[PDB]
Amino acid sequence: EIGTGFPFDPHYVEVLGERMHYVDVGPRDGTPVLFLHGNPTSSYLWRNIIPHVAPSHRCIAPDLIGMGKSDKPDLDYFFDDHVRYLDAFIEALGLEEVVLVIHDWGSALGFHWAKRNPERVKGIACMEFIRPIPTWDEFHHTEVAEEQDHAEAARETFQAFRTADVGRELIIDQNAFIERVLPGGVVRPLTEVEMDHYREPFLKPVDREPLWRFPNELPIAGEPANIVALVEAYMNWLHQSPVPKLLFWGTPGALIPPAEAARLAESLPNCKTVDIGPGLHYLQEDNPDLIGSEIARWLPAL
């Protein structure tokens, strides 16, 4: 998506005693849309999708704590830390019912906030989201042959992130997530302005900590027992939830290759899928016009 700039109004609310940047655009009612980014992104991630929606809805796009232009409170950045800071923000913005547009680790928070706040979620638009990974032969799974190689590489890649010192060398000293994994996850080439934008919140290896904690929070193998249980928990909720669902996909996909999205087209009730064409993991950067066109369209009848 040609869209290279981030012209939004520089808003900042305070949360559990801490500043959080966010994007607020749109009429300023109906039912607000929350765009929750994952790792290792920020509001910059939703920047060309949101304009499709603002014409009709209020688009809010928080920058996770320790992430983006938010504040870097000094903490480990587990998953509950983020759970906490959102929940405080949401109340801070005093927003009542929402529609949710949620990405990678942004969907873990999204689905978790919804499973705890069912009658507050008016709809769920999602794409490459975090669900339970029983084993590794299951991570980045695929039943297309020509791609069995790529899933292995990735499997090994996340392998390293989760191991004693190499997680920290790679992700932290060498900024693996920003410098290789991100641009990795987008099919087309990523301009330097686009990179600088993603790089910016991150010029200090001492700060890369969250882009490290996330990989190790990943519910792979029943590790860590705790996150796992809440992902089994909201995927169980989701699987049973009437809330209308919008799930976007891409070939070869990543966390959700085409096989699953097709499965999830029936596995999840009241669920339309949309094919964004060639894409990897960071779909927002491959075909963001469509993603917004179809959010725009999917909303009114909610």
Side-chain angles (χ1 to χ4, degrees), residues 2-302:
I2 31 211
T4 200
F6 192 75
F8 302 91
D9 295 332
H11 293 291
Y12 291 105
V13 57
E14 270 256 308
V15 211
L16 306 184
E18 260 296 35
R19 274 207 316 162
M20 281 181 65
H21 166 67
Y22 65 83
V23 170
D24 183 25
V25 184
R28 247 245 54 149
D29 33 69
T31 197
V33 186
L34 212 45
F35 301 78
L36 318 180
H37 85 106
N39 179 40
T41 30
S42 56
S43 27
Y44 195 76
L45 178 60
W46 307 110
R47 89 246 185 217
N48 315 297
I49 293 106
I50 282 169
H52 283 261
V53 190
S56 67
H57 297 61
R58 175 176 205 229
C59 303
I60 296 169
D63 272 11
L64 290 168
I65 201 49
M67 288 192 93
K69 278 191 190 108
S70 277
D71 272 349
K72 273 142 193 42
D74 121 61
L75 52 97
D76 299 296
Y77 289 97
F78 290 125
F79 177 72
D80 256 272
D81 299 333
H82 275 288
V83 185
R84 251 193 294 107
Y85 274 87
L86 204 41
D87 288 25
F89 176 85
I90 295 162
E91 303 329 309
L93 296 193
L95 43 100
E96 306 170 323
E97 4 210 344
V98 307
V99 180
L100 298 186
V101 191
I102 64 189
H103 180 213
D104 132 282
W105 261 113
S107 57
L109 301 158
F111 289 118
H112 194 210
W113 189 91
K115 162 202 140 198
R116 276 179 292 117
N117 284 286
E119 79 312 334
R120 266 178 84 174
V121 195
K122 253 159 132 245
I124 295 183
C126 62
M127 65 222 76
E128 300 277 320
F129 56 96
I130 304 183
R131 70 147 135 85
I133 322 72
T135 33
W136 291 89
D137 214 300
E138 200 50 51
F139 187 70
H140 275 52
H141 196 56
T142 18
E143 224 70 78
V144 186
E146 174 234 46
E147 160 84 22
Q148 300 298 175
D149 279 354
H150 305 189
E152 265 306 291
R155 218 159 275 154
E156 277 160 25
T157 304
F158 276 80
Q159 226 80 116
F161 293 172
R162 276 166 87 76
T163 48
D165 250 339
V166 203
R168 317 199 62 95
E169 314 238 317
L170 269 166
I171 283 174
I172 291 199
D173 312 312
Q174 282 132 42
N175 203 8
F177 243 98
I178 266 320
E179 295 285 7
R180 298 172 155 269
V181 177
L182 176 61
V186 171
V187 167
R188 58 113 174 172
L190 265 183
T191 312
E192 274 296 318
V193 14
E194 282 165 335
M195 276 298 251
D196 277 312
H197 263 143
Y198 275 111
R199 292 193 189 90
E200 155 165 62
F202 286 118
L203 319 133
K204 316 215 166 308
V206 105
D207 266 327
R208 295 165 203 191
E209 187 93 11
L211 331 158
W212 181 86
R213 254 302 154 175
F214 274 129
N216 317 101
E217 284 300 62
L218 271 193
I220 339 288
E223 221 74 280
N226 102 277
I227 283 161
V228 173
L230 90 262
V231 185
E232 309 238 318
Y234 71 46
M235 288 302 314
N236 195 302
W237 173 80
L238 195 67
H239 264 96
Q240 288 163 11
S241 182
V243 67
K245 277 110 145 141
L246 204 56
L247 164 103
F248 295 78
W249 65 277
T251 329
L255 268 256
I256 305 275
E260 183 64 10
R263 236 180 312 277
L264 286 173
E266 296 268 329
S267 187
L268 310 168
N270 300 318
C271 182
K272 176 176 227 50
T273 62
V274 159
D275 191 336
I276 72 164
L280 280 158
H281 180 67
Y282 294 99
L283 293 209
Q284 298 75 338
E285 309 286 14
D286 273 311
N287 184 165
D289 285 314
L290 191 66
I291 303 173
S293 330
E294 290 291 298
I295 301 305
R297 187 164 90 107
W298 166 70
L299 283 160
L302 296 194

